[PDB]
Structure 1
């Protein structure tokens, strides 16, 4: 993977509205709040899109409702990060609590990471699920 740091030159940050548009349009989802990224499932799917085979897709819990399930999804994501040489520590313990500030900070970074690595490949996120 191409790593993204606080010192990297990136595009402007997105509003919460435009960030949710990116997630929902790219993955054919229906999130209404950034806090919902606490489940880790969308991140797992974006890793599948970026680097097919990096993520254990069959193990991701796409309808997770409980914190321990969120943690399972994030452990899948961490394993994908390790596989791809991603030098970002994921603050899993914080994210899964569903607080806006922590989740918004991480998604801003993740979108920059995504944009640095996406090759434009076609992807059917419904078919993938």
Structure 2
């Protein structure tokens, strides 16, 4: 399969999305019910999005889908980091900041990730039940 297309500060991208529109995209894409951007700090949605982009790049059997504690969030980001390495994604994930559930760091990361997704997504169907 093809390697990831990286997104840089110099890459041409769409404009940033509002909190509402970003969550609408997450919810539609993954069949989720997120209401706060900070829910992305668990790492699980990122792992699923990587599977949707490049099926097989991520070890979804390791993903904690009902994570509630920092150590579980770090667990999921380890899974995400492995997927990034496998796909040649060169973006540094600020894991320590994200897992604290801080708004600013989580909002910046999802803005980048949406641009990354748009640069890479081929329109394939994604069954969110299969990983669960």
**TM-score w.r.t. structure 2 length?**
0.96
How many residue pairs match? The answer is 129
Q: Is the counterpart of residue 85 in structure 1 residue 84 in structure 2? A: no
5+ residue gaps, structure 1, are none
Instruction: After TM superposition, give the deviation of residue 77 of structure 1 in Å.
Output: 0.2
2:62 paired residue among 59, 72, 91: 59
The answer to whether the 8 A contact 2:61-2:131 is kept is no
Q: In the aligned structure 1, how far is the partner of 2:99 from the partner of 2:27? A: 20
**TM-score w.r.t. structure 1 length?**
0.98
5+ residue gaps, structure 2, are none
Match in the other structure for 1:9:
12
* 1:48-106 C-alpha deviation (Å, 9 max, x unpaired): 00000000001100000000000000000000000000010000000000011100000
Instruction: After TM superposition, give the deviation of residue 107 of structure 1 in Å.
Output: 0.2
The answer to whether the 8 A contact 1:47-1:55 is kept is yes
* 1:7-49 C-alpha deviation (Å, 9 max, x unpaired): 1000111000000000011101111100111100000000000
Stretches of 4+ moved more than 3 A in 1?
none
Match in the other structure for 1:47:
50
